[PDB]
Amino acid sequence: MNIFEMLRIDEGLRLKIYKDTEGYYTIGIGHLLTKSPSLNAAKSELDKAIGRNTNGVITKDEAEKLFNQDVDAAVRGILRNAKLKPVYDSLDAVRRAAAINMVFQMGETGVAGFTNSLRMLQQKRWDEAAVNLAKSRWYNQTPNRAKRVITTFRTGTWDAYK
Ligand SMILES: Fc1cccc(F)c1CBr
């Protein structure tokens, strides 16, 4: 296990434009294309991302390339966020992957309400943090995935992904 294998499990792999859990156009390994309801707009974003006329379909190599970029950008964003960086740096590598998972899914805006969870995580109050994290739209809308991520934070192990 590592962040790549973890997110590949949670996001899956689809080579044609599909809608994610929120109804947004997406491709590959959870690569959000746009929040616009326009499929043409999504197709435009895809072509721009890949660098060719894709007509809504990409290869596995192309999917993995975008994925690698997306993971890189996610973790780098964490380090550039004054609130997230100190919590991230306090974590071990397994829990760091759980952190990146959340940011991949929700973005930095999506985790701005997690102030109290973040404090509990930095404090290493793992059970309390796990309880706090579940008190969320995130948990309610994607419970199976959230439970996996939360278990990773609670235990510092990959048990939820084995
Ligand atoms: F603990 C962290 C550190 C950085 C990002 C993040 F989503 C988390 C889980 Br609310």
Quoted resolution (Å): 1.8
The residue whose C-alpha atom lies closest to atom 3 belonging to ligand 1 is: 88
Tell how far the Cα of 120 is from the centroid of ligand 1, in angstroms: 11
Q: Are 30 and 12 in contact (CB under 8 A)?
A: yes
Q: Are 148 and 161 in contact (CB under 8 A)?
A: yes
Query: What are the angstrom distances between the C-alpha of 127 and each of 11, 92, 101, 103, 117?
Result: 26, 16, 19, 21, 11
Q: In what order do the strands lie in the sheet with 25-28?
A: 14-19, 25-28, 31-32
**Whole-number Å distance between alpha carbons of 91 and 34:** 31
Tell how far the Cα of 62 is from the centroid of ligand 1, in angstroms: 28
**Whole-number Å distance between alpha carbons of 131 and 141:** 16
Q: Which residues does the annotation place in the binding site?
A: 32, 104, 117, 132
| Domains of the chain by start residue, with CATH | 1-162 (1.10.530.40)
Buried b (16+ CB within 10 A) or exposed e, 39-51: eeebbebbeebbe
